[PDB]
Amino acid sequence: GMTLAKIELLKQLLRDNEAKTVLKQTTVDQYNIIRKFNTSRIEKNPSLRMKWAMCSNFPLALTKGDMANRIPLEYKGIQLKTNAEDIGTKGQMCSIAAVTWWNTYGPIGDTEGFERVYESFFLRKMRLDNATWGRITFGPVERVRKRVLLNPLTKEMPPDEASNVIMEILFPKEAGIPRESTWIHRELIKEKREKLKGTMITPIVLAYMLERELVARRRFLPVAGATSAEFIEMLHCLQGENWRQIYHPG
Amino acid sequence: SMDTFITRNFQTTIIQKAKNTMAEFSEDPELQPAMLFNICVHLEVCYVISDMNFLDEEGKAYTANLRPQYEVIEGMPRTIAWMVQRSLAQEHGIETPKYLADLFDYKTKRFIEVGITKGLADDYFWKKKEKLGNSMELMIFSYNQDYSLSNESSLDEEGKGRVLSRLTELQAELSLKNLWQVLIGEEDVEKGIDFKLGQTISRLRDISVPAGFSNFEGMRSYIDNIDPKGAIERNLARMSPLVSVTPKKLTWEDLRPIGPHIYNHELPEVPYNAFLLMSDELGLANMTEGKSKKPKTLAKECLEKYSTLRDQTDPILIMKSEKANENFLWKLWRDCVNTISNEEMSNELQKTNYAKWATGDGLTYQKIMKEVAIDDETMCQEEPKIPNKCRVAAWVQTEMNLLSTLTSKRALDLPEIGPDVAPVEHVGSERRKYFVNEINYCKASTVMMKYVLFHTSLLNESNASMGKYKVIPITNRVVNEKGESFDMLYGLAVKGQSHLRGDTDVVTVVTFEFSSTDPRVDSGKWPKYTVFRIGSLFVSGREKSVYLYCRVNGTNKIQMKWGMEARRCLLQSMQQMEAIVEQESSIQGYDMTKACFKGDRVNSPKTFSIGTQEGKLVKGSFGKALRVIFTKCLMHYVFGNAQLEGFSAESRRLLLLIQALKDRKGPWVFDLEGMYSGIEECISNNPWVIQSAYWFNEWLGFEKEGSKV
Amino acid sequence: MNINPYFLFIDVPIQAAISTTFPYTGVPPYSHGTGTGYTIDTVIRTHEYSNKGKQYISDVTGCTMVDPTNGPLPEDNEPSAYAQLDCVLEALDRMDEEHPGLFQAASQNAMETLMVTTVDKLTQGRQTFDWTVCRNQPAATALNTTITSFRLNDLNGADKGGLIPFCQDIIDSLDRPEMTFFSVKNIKKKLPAKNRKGFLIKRIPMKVKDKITKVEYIKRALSLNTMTKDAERGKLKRRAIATAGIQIRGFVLVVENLAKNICENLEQSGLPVGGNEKKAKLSNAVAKMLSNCPPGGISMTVTGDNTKWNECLNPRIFLAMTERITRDSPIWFRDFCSIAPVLFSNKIARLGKGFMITSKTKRLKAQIPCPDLFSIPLERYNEETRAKLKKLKPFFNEEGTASLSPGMMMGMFNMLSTVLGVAALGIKNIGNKEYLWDGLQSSDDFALFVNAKDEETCMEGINDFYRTCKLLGINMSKKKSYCNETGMFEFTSMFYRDGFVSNFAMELPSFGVAGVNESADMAIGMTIIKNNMINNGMGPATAQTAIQLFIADYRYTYKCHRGDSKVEGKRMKIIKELWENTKGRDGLLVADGGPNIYNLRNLHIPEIVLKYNLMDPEYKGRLLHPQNPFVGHLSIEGIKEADITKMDYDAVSGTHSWRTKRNRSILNTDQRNMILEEQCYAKCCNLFEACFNSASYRKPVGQHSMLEAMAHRLRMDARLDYESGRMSKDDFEKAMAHLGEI
RNA sequence: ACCUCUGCUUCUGCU
RNA sequence: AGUAGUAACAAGAG
- Among A57, A133, A173, beta carbon nearest to B86: A173
**Which single residue has its CA nearest the C1' atom of nucleotide E14?**
C668
Amino acid occupying residue A200: M
Using CA atoms of C120, C121, C123, C127 in order, give the dihedral in degrees to the nearest 10: -150
Between the CA of residue B681 and those of B257, B650, C609, C638, C678, what are the distances in Å? 14, 10, 54, 45, 50
Q: Is C137 helix (H, G, I), strand (E, B) or coil?
A: strand
Q: Rounded to whole angstroms, how far apart are CA atoms B368 and C697?
A: 52
Q: Rounded to whole angstroms, how far apart are CA atoms C311 and C473?
A: 10
Chains interfacing with C (3 or more CB pairs < 8 Å): A, B
Between the CA of residue A27 and those of B27, C159, C700, C702, what are the distances in Å? 19, 7, 10, 7
For B139, the enclosing helix (H) or strand (E) is strand B137-142
Chains interfacing with A (3 or more CB pairs < 8 Å): B, C
Q: Rounded to whole angstroms, how far apart are CA atoms A211 and B572?
A: 37
User: How many other β-carbons are positioned within 10 Å of the β-carbon of residue C164?
Assistant: 22
Residue C730 neighbours by CB under 8 Å, 6+ apart: none
> Which residue of chain A has the CA closest to C516?
A46
Considering only the C-alpha atoms of chain B, give the largest distance between any 2 of them, rounded to a whole number of Å.
Answer: 127
Secondary structure in 3-state letters for C119-134: HHHHHHCCCEEECCCC
Cβ contact, residue pair B609, C369, below 8 Å: no
Q: How many CA atoms lie within 13 A of A211 on its CB side?
A: 19
In degrees rounded to 5, what are phi and psi of residue C598? -70, 140
Counted residue by residue, chain A has a size of 250
Query: DSSP characters for C409-445?
Result: -TTSSHHHHHHHHHHHHTT--STT-SEEEEEEEETTE
Q: Rounded to whole angstroms, how far apart are CA atoms B83 and C128?
A: 37
Amino acid occupying residue B186: E
Q: Note every long-range contact of B368-374, with CB atoms under 8 Å and residues 24 or more positions apart, other chains counting.
A: B368/C364, B368/C365, B368/C366, B369/C366, B370/C366, B370/C367, B370/C368, B370/C369, B370/C372, B372/C366, B373/C357, B373/C364, B373/C366, B373/C368, B374/C368, B374/C372, B374/C375, B374/C376
CA C372 to chain centre: 31
B501 CB neighbours strand D below 7 A: yes
B466 and A CB contact within 8 Å: no
Best to test chain B binding among A43, A243, A244 (most B CBs inside 10 Å)? A243
Between helix C315-325 and helix C246-263 the angle, nearest 10°, is 60
Rg (CA), chain C: 30
Q: Rounded to whole angstroms, how far apart are CA atoms A105 and B575?
A: 44
CA distance B314 to chain C (A): 36
Q: Rounded to whole angstroms, how far apart are CA atoms C350 and C256?
A: 24
Domain containing residue A32: 1-250
Q: Do you find a cis peptide bond into B419, omega within 30 degrees of 0? A: no
Q: Rounded to whole angstroms, how far apart are CA atoms B171 and B180?
A: 7
Contact C704, A177 (CB under 8 A): no
End-to-end CA distance of chain B: 102
Q: Rounded to whole angstroms, how far apart are CA atoms C368 and B369?
A: 9
Residue C157 is classified by DSSP as: G
Residue B612 neighbours by CB under 8 Å, 6+ apart: B618, B698, C1, C2, C4
Burial class (CB in 10 A: 0-12, 13-18, 19+), B98: middle
A190 and C CB contact within 8 Å: no
Q: Rounded to whole angstroms, how far apart are CA atoms C567 and B292?
A: 5
Selection from C300, C265, C218 nearest residue C103 by Cα = C265
Q: Note every long-range contact of C575-583, with CB atoms under 8 Å and residues 24 or more positions apart, other chains counting.
A: C575/A100, C577/A104, C578/A100, C578/A103, C578/A104, C578/C619, C581/A104, C582/C616, C582/C619, C583/C616
CA C655 to chain centre: 31
Q: Is C307 helix (H, G, I), strand (E, B) or coil?
A: coil
Q: What residues 427-456 of chain C have any CB closer than 8 A to a CB of chain A?
A: none
> Which residue of chain B has the CA closest to C544?
B428
- Check residues 683 to 742 of chain C and report those whose beta carbon is under 7 Å from nucleic acid strand D: none
Amino acid occupying residue B307: S
Selection from A215, A62, A200, A109 nearest residue A153 by Cα = A215
A39 CB neighbours strand D below 7 A: yes
Using CA atoms of B443, B444, B450, B452 in order, give the dihedral in degrees to the nearest 10: -150
Residue B462 with chain A: CB contacts under 8 Å:
55
C742 and A CB contact within 8 Å: yes
Cβ contact, residue pair A2, C690, below 8 Å: yes
Cβ contact, residue pair B83, C32, below 8 Å: no
Query: DSSP characters for A149-209?
Result: ESS--SS-B-HHHHHHHHHHHH-GGG--S--HHHHHTHHHHHHHHHHTSS--S-HHHHHHH
For C96, the enclosing helix (H) or strand (E) is helix C85-98
Contact C659, A60 (CB under 8 A): yes
Contact C24, C233 (CB under 8 A): yes
CA of C198 to C1' of D15 (A): 23
End-to-end CA distance of chain A: 45
Burial class (CB in 10 A: 0-12, 13-18, 19+), C662: buried
A129 and C CB contact within 8 Å: no
Strand partners, B380: C358
Q: Rounded to whole angstroms, how far apart are CA atoms C324 and C345?
A: 17
B499 CB neighbours strand D below 7 A: yes
- Check residues 52 to 81 of chain A and report those whose beta carbon is under 7 Å from nucleic acid strand D: 52-53, 56
Contact B581, B588 (CB under 8 A): no
For B532, the enclosing helix (H) or strand (E) is strand B530-538
Between the CA of residue B510 and those of A90, B270, B473, B497, B555, what are the distances in Å? 41, 21, 11, 12, 11
Between the CA of residue C396 and those of B664, C81, C350, C351, C404, what are the distances in Å? 54, 21, 10, 10, 10
Give me the sign of the Cα torsion angle B354, B358, B361, B367.
Answer: positive
Considering only the C-alpha atoms of chain C, give the largest distance between any 2 of them, rounded to a whole number of Å.
Answer: 99
CA distance A149 to chain C (A): 14
Residue C236 neighbours by CB under 8 Å, 6+ apart: B642, B643, B645, B646, B647, B681, B682
Strand partners, B104: B71, B111
Q: Rounded to whole angstroms, how far apart are CA atoms A181 and A159?
A: 12
Strand partners, C241: C227
Q: Rounded to whole angstroms, how far apart are CA atoms B30 and C255?
A: 34
Q: Rounded to whole angstroms, how far apart are CA atoms B261 and C279?
A: 41
Between helix B231-238 and helix C455-470 the angle, nearest 10°, is 100
Counted residue by residue, chain C has a size of 742
Strands annotated E in C214-284: 223-228, 240-244
Contact B679, B654 (CB under 8 A): yes
Selection from B649, B635, B14, B597 nearest residue B272 by Cα = B635
Query: DSSP characters for C701-735?
Result: --SSBHHHHHHHHHHHHHHHHHHTTSS-HHHHHHH
**Which single residue has its CA nearest the C1' atom of nucleotide D5?**
C668
Output the CA angle B19-B25-B28, nearest 5 degrees: 50
Contact B152, B168 (CB under 8 A): no
B586 and A CB contact within 8 Å: yes
SS3 content of chain B, % helix, strand, coil (to 5): 45, 15, 35
For B372, the enclosing helix (H) or strand (E) is helix B370-375
A125 and B CB contact within 8 Å: no
Q: Rounded to whole angstroms, how far apart are CA atoms B487 and C245?
A: 57
Q: Rounded to whole angstroms, how far apart are CA atoms C429 and B115?
A: 70
Residue B355 neighbours by CB under 8 Å, 6+ apart: B332, B335, B349, B361, B469, B494
Resolution number, Å: 2.7
Contact A136, A243 (CB under 8 A): yes
User: How many other β-carbons are positioned within 10 Å of the β-carbon of residue B618?
Assistant: 15
Strand duo C128-130 + C135-137: pairing: antiparallel
b or e along A165-195 (b: 16 or more beta carbons within 10 Å of the residue's beta carbon)?
bbbbbbbbbbbbbbbebbeebeebbeebeeb
Selection from C522, C582, C570, C513 nearest residue A94 by Cα = C570
User: How many other β-carbons are positioned within 10 Å of the β-carbon of residue C244?
Assistant: 21
Cβ contact, residue pair A51, B464, below 8 Å: no
Best to test chain A binding among C122, C126, C227, C694 (most A CBs inside 10 Å)? C694
Q: Rounded to whole angstroms, how far apart are CA atoms A51 and C287?
A: 47
Selection from C589, C562, C586 nearest residue C576 by Cα = C562
- Among B76, B232, B565, beta carbon nearest to C87: B232
Q: Rounded to whole angstroms, how far apart are CA atoms C652 and C200?
A: 55
Q: Rounded to whole angstroms, how far apart are CA atoms A204 and C657?
A: 14
Contact B321, B528 (CB under 8 A): yes
Selection from A122, B77, A43, A226 nearest residue C708 by Cα = B77
Q: Is C67 annotated as a binding residue?
A: no
In degrees rounded to 5, what are phi and psi of residue C35? -115, 5
Cβ contact, residue pair A103, C592, below 8 Å: yes
Q: Rounded to whole angstroms, how far apart are CA atoms C244 and B238?
A: 39
Strand duo C364-368 + B366-367: pairing: parallel
Q: How many CA atoms lie within 13 A of B226 on its CB side?
A: 16
Number of structural domains in chain A: 1
CA of B510 to C1' of E2 (A): 9
Contact A245, B582 (CB under 8 A): no
Q: Rounded to whole angstroms, how far apart are CA atoms A47 and B564?
A: 11
Q: Which nucleotide is nearest to B553 (CA to C1')?
A: E2
Q: Rounded to whole angstroms, how far apart are CA atoms B660 and C397?
A: 51
Considering only the C-alpha atoms of chain A, give the largest distance between any 2 of them, rounded to a whole number of Å.
Answer: 76
Between the CA of residue A11 and those of A17, A21, C710, C740, what are the distances in Å? 11, 13, 11, 11
Measured to protein CB atoms, the chain D nucleotides within 7 Å are 5-15
Selection from B466, B468, B464 nearest residue B351 by Cα = B468
Measured to protein CB atoms, the chain E nucleotides within 7 Å are 1-14
C673 CB neighbours strand D below 7 A: no
B466 CB neighbours strand D below 7 A: yes
Q: Rounded to whole angstroms, how far apart are CA atoms C593 and C559?
A: 9
Output the CA angle C144-C145-C148, nearest 5 degrees: 85
Q: Rounded to whole angstroms, how far apart are CA atoms B252 and C536?
A: 33
Burial class (CB in 10 A: 0-12, 13-18, 19+), B149: middle
Selection from C147, C132, C165, C126 nearest residue C681 by Cα = C147
For B224, the enclosing helix (H) or strand (E) is helix B216-225
Contact C70, C54 (CB under 8 A): no
Residue C642 neighbours by CB under 8 Å, 6+ apart: C514, C516, C520, C524, C648, C649
Q: Rounded to whole angstroms, how far apart are CA atoms B615 and A45?
A: 47
CA distance A246 to chain B (A): 9
